[PDB]
Design an enzyme around this catalytic site. Structure first.
Site, PDB file in Angstrom:
ATOM      1  N   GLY A  82       0.785  -1.224   0.000  1.00  0.00           N
ATOM      2  CA  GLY A  82       0.000   0.000   0.000  1.00  0.00           C
ATOM      3  C   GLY A  82       0.820   1.279   0.000  1.00  0.00           C
ATOM      4  N   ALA A  83       2.108   1.184  -0.306  1.00  0.00           N
ATOM      5  CA  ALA A  83       2.913   2.394  -0.329  1.00  0.00           C
ATOM      6  C   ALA A  83       2.435   3.232  -1.502  1.00  0.00           C
ATOM      7  CB  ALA A  83       4.380   2.070  -0.496  1.00  0.00           C
ATOM      8  N   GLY A  84       2.231   2.576  -2.641  1.00  0.00           N
ATOM      9  CA  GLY A  84       1.786   3.285  -3.822  1.00  0.00           C
ATOM     10  C   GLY A  84       0.464   4.009  -3.657  1.00  0.00           C
ATOM     11  N   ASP A  85      -0.462   3.396  -2.930  1.00  0.00           N
ATOM     12  CA  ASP A  85      -1.777   3.986  -2.711  1.00  0.00           C
ATOM     13  C   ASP A  85      -1.674   5.182  -1.776  1.00  0.00           C
ATOM     14  OD1 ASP A  85      -3.031   1.690  -4.132  1.00  0.00           O
ATOM     15  OD2 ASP A  85      -2.408   0.593  -2.327  1.00  0.00           O
TER      16      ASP A  85
HETATM   17  K   LIG Z   1       3.358  -1.337   4.000  1.00  0.00           K
END
Ligand SMILES: [K+]
Ligand SMILES: [K+]
Ligand SMILES: [K+]
Ligand SMILES: [K+]
Lengths: 297, 296
Positions: B237-240
């Site tokens: 979820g880094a991209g989100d």
């Molecule tokens: K993470």
């Protein structure tokens, strides 16, 4: 005599908190097989499952319970069912259990029992497997137990059910149904107004369940009733499967069967039907030989 | 101005105690919406979910975070997605996949519309996305296309290059990852591919580089924004989180200029790190963001 169960096996996720699911083994046919096995009976599961997580998990569960899995095949090109108890919400579309077919059938023997329900009848491959399986078991001099475990919402065209139900009571030695399912079939509002429903469809023996109320045996000597122990629900999941499980465990002790055995059979049913509701898994409180009597008396 | 996120909303099952899983909120579009919300921005989710346990569970998470769900439609004949990790899927029709153009709300000048290729893979969702971008532009609004490439989930991997280009055409800003560039261009080094989307009609592109931060491509040139130093442990979820903080900024105004676009990327790298350092969910609230932008 060995009891052969054919059909569904799945992972059932039942909630607890407001953010988590409890993972339990499942499947109407699986629950019944594990039930019969735990009571010390000899049981074999005929079916399909993917060579996936849910697959191996449920498979292992069969072994830990003494359920023969020689005829349970795991196909990697498939995905094993997973539903969520919330009253069911199925997640996997075709469902690996629907891929079982006549080739997967084991040679049958005299006096053995074959079990199957309408769930095995929903999708094509399996459907053929079930009806052929029953046909062979009868030809082999064996008994067939049809549980009309009606699952309306699972069907594509509900316009096949009335017909496949009749061709099963035909092959069926004993048909088991619920109060509701009768009404839901006969179109009648009072099951009793249509309790010879299955009998008039080709089956001479009917065992109609009635909740914490018990069951009604309907042969030809007359209608016999049986009381269900003092209930105390925790999870109604699998009462019906536990009922049929105990039913086959009994019938399987003899080669032939009459009202006598049919009564000791239904007593085991009502019993195993009450206990199972005490735990929180479909097959969590399925009794062992030693836990059944302690509860009985 | 309001940020509209359209796309995936699914319940992630994560192992736990003994034969027990725990519900986890997820979905690229969901995470972003929740990200924008938490940071005290105005966000709305456009999509579908089954009226099953999950479907209703997810709606709750959106509410507990300040995400408007007026246009989140809960069907009965559908089934909300559910994944089990240890990331094997289970529901293939996919409820979130049934969102269509008539589930779109009315857009208004200076608003942002967000979507990714994930929304572009199945049919109704695909029409819904491209129409949504078309309308937001006509309404004098903004579109943020995140080419969150998921080769696997895609059925026909040939439709991808085409849908990506048609998307770049509609987008106001395109966000992509170093690898994502290599996947489409086929190059080994992404720099050899930093103009891949530019030649497809997108005047402004933000190529995520992760720990190295981010490179911005615009007509006047390209500017590098390094990332905050952190102990890299979990990049989920880094991209989100990165895109979430990015929208939360570009909305705080009407027509982003040199300076706002400059600060947006700083929020992205920031929100993108709090993730890799902590436990999705690694999304912060304004209070925590700040205590971090500084000594952290
Ligand atoms: K993470
Ligand atoms: K019969
Ligand atoms: K139960
Ligand atoms: K464009």
């Amino acid at each position: 005599n060995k009891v052969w169960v054919i059909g569904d096996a799945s992972v059932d996720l039942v909630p607890e908190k407001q953010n988590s699911y409890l993972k339990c083994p499942g499947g109407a046919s699986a629950n019944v097989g594990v039930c019969v096995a735990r009571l010390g009976g000899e049981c074999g599961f005929i079916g399909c499952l993917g060579d996936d997580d849910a697959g191996r998990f449920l498979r292992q569960v069969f072994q830990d319970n003494g359920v023969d899995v020689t005829f349970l095949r795991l196909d990697a090109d498939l995905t094993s069912a997973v539903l969520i108890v919330n009253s069911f919400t199925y997640l996997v579309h075709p469902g690996a259990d629907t891929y079982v077919s006549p080739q997967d059938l084991p040679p049958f023997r005299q006096y053995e029992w074959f079990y199957f329900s309408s769930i095995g009848l929903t999708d094509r491959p399996a459907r053929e497997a079930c009806l052929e399986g029953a046909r062979r078991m009868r030809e082999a001099g064996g008994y067939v137990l049809f549980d009309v475990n009606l699952r309306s919402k699972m069907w594509g065209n509900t316009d096949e059910i009335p017909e496949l139900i009749a061709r099963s009571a035909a092959l069926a030695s004993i048909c088991k149904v619920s109060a509701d399912e009768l009404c839901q079939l006969s179109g009648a509002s009072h099951w009793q107004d249509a309790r010879y429903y299955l009998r008039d469809l080709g089956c001479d023996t009917t065992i109609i369940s009635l909740g914490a109320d018990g069951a009604l045996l309907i042969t030809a000597e007359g209608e016999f009733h049986f009381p269900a122990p003092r209930v105390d629900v925790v999870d109604t999941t699998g009462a019906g499967d536990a009922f049929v499980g105990g039913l086959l465990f009994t019938l399987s002790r003899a080669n032939c069967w009459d009202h006598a055995l049919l009564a000791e059979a239904i007593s085991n049913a009502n019993a195993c039907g009450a206990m199972a509701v005490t735990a929180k898994g479909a097959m969590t409180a399925l009794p062992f030989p030693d836990q059944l009597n302690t509860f009985l008396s």
